[PDB]
Amino acid sequence: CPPAKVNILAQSRPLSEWPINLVSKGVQEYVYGLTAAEREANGDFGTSRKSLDRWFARTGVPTHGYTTVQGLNLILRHTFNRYDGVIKKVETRNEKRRSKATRINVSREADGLPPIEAEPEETAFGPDGKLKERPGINPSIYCYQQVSPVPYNPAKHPALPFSGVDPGAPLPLGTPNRLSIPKGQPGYVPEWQRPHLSTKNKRIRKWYARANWRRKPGRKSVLDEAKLKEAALKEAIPIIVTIGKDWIVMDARGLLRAVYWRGIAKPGLSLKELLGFFSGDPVLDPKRGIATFTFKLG
DNA sequence: GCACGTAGGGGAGAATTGG
RNA sequence: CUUGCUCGGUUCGCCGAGACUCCCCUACGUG
DNA sequence: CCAATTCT
Numbered sequence: 001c002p003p004a005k006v007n008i009l010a011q012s013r014p015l016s017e018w019p020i021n022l023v024s025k026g027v028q029e030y031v032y033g034l035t036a037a038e039r040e041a042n043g044d045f046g047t048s049r050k051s052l053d054r055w056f057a058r059t060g061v062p063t064h065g066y067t068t069v070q071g072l073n074l075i076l077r078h079t080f081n082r083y084d085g086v087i088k089k090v091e092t093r094n095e096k097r098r099s100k101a102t103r104i105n106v107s108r109e110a111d112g113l114p115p116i117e118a119e120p121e122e123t124a125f126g127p128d129g130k131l132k133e134r135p136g137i138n139p140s141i142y143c144y145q146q147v148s149p150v151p152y153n154p155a156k157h158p159a160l161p162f163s164g165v166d167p168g169a170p171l172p173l174g175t176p177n178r179l180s181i182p183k184g185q186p187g188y189v190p191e192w193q194r195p196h197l198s199t200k201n202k203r204i205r206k207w208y209a210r211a212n213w214r215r216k217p218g219r220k221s222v223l224d225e226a227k228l229k230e231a232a233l234k235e236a237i238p239i240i241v242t243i244g245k246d247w248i249v250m251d252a253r254g255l256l257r258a259v260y261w262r263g264i265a266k267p268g269l270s271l272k273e274l275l276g277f278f279s280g281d282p283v284l285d286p287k288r289g290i291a292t293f294t295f296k297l298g
Numbered sequence: 299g300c301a302c303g304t305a306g307g308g309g310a311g312a313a314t315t316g317g
Numbered sequence: 318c319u320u321g322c323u324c325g326g327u328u329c330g331c332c333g334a335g336a337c338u339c340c341c342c343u344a345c346g347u348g
Numbered sequence: 349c350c351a352a353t354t355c356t
Binding site for chain 1: 306307310312
């Protein structure tokens, strides 16, 4: 399942003010300060409505309005599974230390001498019982089924300056021709460049790509982001993920490029089929402002 | 101290069911 | 092959050659 | 209609 990455275009509130992330941060801060004995008593978390309403009331951890079961089994299963990772990290190395004790022992009966002194075992919990190398907060907002990207609709989805594309209509194939533009119009190829163009089928960049305008010592092209950041919005492909009262609109063009260069899909594909080649569980990065889609088994 | 290999733990659904 | 990114050419209009398994966290070396 | 359920 190779990755695929898309850019966020709209955002009701930042991803750090989201109850899905506010709860997630609160859950693991409470957990990462447990002793090896408090975790066992507090590690009886179910995958049900009643159990999660028991865990979130017995263990104090506040809920900011988040009571979605499918979005609380990606927070309470990841947190405790990373918790055991630190102890496992210790005892997958200490195991090799007690395998090292085997290594020194094996030669020892051959010599016949009594076994030599060996290193002791090092735990992962400090003197107070709290974990020594306490994990850090994962900022990733993992998505669940009932909230998956869907095509943007101007009617039902909230009013937003954009253009909506019907699933039924196949996604258009941009800049089909290259040299058919008259002089001056953004996209015009000068006549001298027309000889010695590519005879091979490669990715085609559009005139407002940053790679075409990136500053470098040999370039004298003026960068004005009041134009290269407005032409792209009209031609964008919006897909929306709506958690509660909060909605993210992304740019599906990052998925359209992926299928093209990997041979999965041709020029004529619907938005449904484009979104149907990927998992319905994006991964979000609040700091970068990016969403990471994944493929399927085929 | 920014920077870097590195090493090593974790993570990256979706088909039925029921009010 | 419409976004993003890297190394280049340009009459400055956009053209050539590419990369694509990524993210989080905690450790230990290099000056 | 759409959350909660059970399995890899």
